[PDB]
Amino acid sequence: NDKVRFIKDELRLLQEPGSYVGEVIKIVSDKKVLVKVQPEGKYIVDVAKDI
Amino acid sequence: TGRDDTKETVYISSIALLKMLKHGRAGVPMEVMGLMLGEFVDDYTVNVVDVFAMPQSGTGVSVEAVDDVFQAKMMDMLKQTGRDQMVVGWYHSHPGFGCWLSSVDVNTQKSFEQLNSRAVAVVVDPIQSVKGKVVIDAFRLIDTGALINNLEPRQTTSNTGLLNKANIQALIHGLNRHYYSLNIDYHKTAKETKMLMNLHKEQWQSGLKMYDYEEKEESNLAATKSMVKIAEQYSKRIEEEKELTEEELKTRYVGRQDPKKHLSETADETLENNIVSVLTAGVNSVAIK
Amino acid sequence: TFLHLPCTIEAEEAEEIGVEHLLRDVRDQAAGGLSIRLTNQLKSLKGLQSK
Amino acid sequence: NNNSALSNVNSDIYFKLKKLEKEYELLTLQEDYIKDEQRHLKRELKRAQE
């Protein structure tokens, strides 16, 4: 049972959309941060609920 | 208000499904323009017997992509065979985007909404359908004035109350201001069930056939040899494994692509084959002679 | 006269996707594990006799 | 010390323990059920890999 749920779990997250990676250039006081994505422009984007 | 405005459970038959996928996968890149023909009952149940691809166009999706000659032509000939049904909405392909209605798709939607206010717009993306429900979803206009005054949820009774959406983006932006989303279900009979599973009288035929023994003997040797080689890996593993930390065991002596595990599966596989090979052989020897 | 030919199903790509999806049964025959083929062997024998 | 009570045992066999012997057949029924469950999840392994 655990083995079937995990394979479905691997599959699940592949169906979910991709992910990226940038580096924070500066901090905004609107509860946001300014990120620069490595092949892409700057974005000011909301932050995760855990930080 | 004057309607219940509760989002319909969409039961698209298995006959209809097959049609809908076929027409959108064909037309890629391109948006394919069709209509849904069924019968609306209740205040929450639509049953879609069949769908029609109206002829493909180079204007994309618009109200200036409805063709009433072509619409009528379909209708008139259903009557004549007695298979008559009425529109309950319309469908279309996105050739490489997620499921949402644009503003321009909302106005196509609007033409049918005059006809009946339980008009569904179904978006198919067939480059991402490797499963039959995935990346297909049905949407329905809500009244604009229900939005202003915040009566927008009221689809949460007469339904399962579960609602699986897909994506951030355009979806949540149109959900808010235009439409209410609800899952497409798929419905089928037991006559259809037998039709798919069954594979003629050549299905039983495969199960008494024997094969060239060059390939059988070859199959055996390959598996046999394979288990010597990863079984030296297994020797290393169970020579050690006297040291604490489970993770540390998996780096050092292996436990990531674990040798005991890989051997056991391959050993079982060829063992099951050869139980079959002798059974199917001994069956034929007695049976046919 | 009418002469019989092979009446095969092989399916289209398009068709395959709706067919598996609707399916939630373990199939008449699929020929997967050993369990399916042990059933199958005995089914074949009844098959040969009927023709 | 010496002696006990032999009626204390004889009483429990017909009363309480007869009910519990029957209860042990309902856990035996559980065994047959999870014999199929264990095979069913082997079939479901095949389908998740495919």
What secondary structure, in 3-state letters, does chain C show? CCCCCCCCCCCCHHHHHHHHHHCCCCCCCCCCCHHHHHHHHHHHHHHHHHC
- Sheet containing B33-41, strands listed edge to edge, beginning at the edge strand earlier in sequence: B179-182, B136-141, B120-124, B86-93, B33-41, B45-54, B9-13, B184-187
Distance between CA A31 and CA B282 in Å, rounded? 75
B193 touches chain C (CB under 8 A): yes
Report the C-alpha dihedral over residues B58, B15, B200, C46, rounded to 10 degrees: 160
Chain-centroid distance of CA B284 in Å reads: 41
Distance between CA B19 and CA B53 in Å, rounded? 9
B15 touches chain C (CB under 8 A): no
D43 touches chain C (CB under 8 A): yes
Distance between CA B206 and CA B187 in Å, rounded? 32
Please say whether the beta carbons of B63 and B28 come within 8 A: no
Residue linked to tokens 């202003």: B148
Q: With an 8 Å Cβ cutoff, are B131 and C34 in contact?
A: no
Q: Which two tokens stand for residue D23?
A: 């209860």
Which of the residues D43, D44, D45, D49 would you substitute to probe the C interface, choosing the one with the greatest number of C C-beta atoms within 10 Å? Answer: D43
CA distances from B224 to B152, B229, B263, B267 (A): 66, 9, 10, 8
DSSP assigned state of B25: H
How far away is chain D from the Cα of A8, in angstroms, using its nearest Cα? 6
**Three-state SS at B55:** coil
Distance between CA D11 and CA D23 in Å, rounded? 18
DSSP A1-51: -HHHHHHHHHHHHHHS-----EEEEEE-SSSEEEEEETTS-EEEEEPPTT-
Q: End-to-end CA distance of chain A: give it in Å, rounded.
A: 34
CA distances from B99 to B105, B127, B134, B138 (A): 11, 13, 10, 9
Method: cryo-EM
C4 touches chain B (CB under 8 A): no
Distance between CA B256 and CA B35 in Å, rounded? 53
**Three-state SS at B212:** coil
Distance between CA B263 and CA B249 in Å, rounded? 19
β-pairing verdict for B9-13 and B184-187 = parallel
The single-letter code of the amino acid at C26 is: V
User: Residues of D with CB below 8 A from A11's CB?
Assistant: 48
Distance between CA D21 and CA A38 in Å, rounded? 71
Please say whether the beta carbons of D42 and A2 come within 8 A: no
Q: Report resolution in angstroms.
A: 6.1
How far away is chain D from the Cα of A17, in angstroms, using its nearest Cα? 20
Q: With an 8 Å Cβ cutoff, are C14 and B22 in contact?
A: yes
Please say whether the beta carbons of B182 and B8 come within 8 A: yes
DSSP H helix total and E strand total for chain B: 9, 8
Q: With an 8 Å Cβ cutoff, are C45 and B283 in contact?
A: yes
How far away is chain B from the Cα of C3, in angstroms, using its nearest Cα? 17
Please say whether the beta carbons of B162 and B94 come within 8 A: no
Q: CB-hemisphere CA count at 13 Å for C1?
A: 3
Please say whether the beta carbons of B99 and B43 come within 8 A: no
Long-range contacts of B14-18 (CB under 8 A, 24+ apart): B14/B186, B14/B187, B14/B188, B14/B192, B14/C18, B14/C22, B15/B49, B15/B50, B15/B192, B16/B48, B16/B49, B16/B50, B16/B51, B17/B132, B17/B186, B17/C18, B17/C21, B17/C22, B18/C14, B18/C15, B18/C18, B18/C19
Distance between CA A19 and CA A1 in Å, rounded? 29
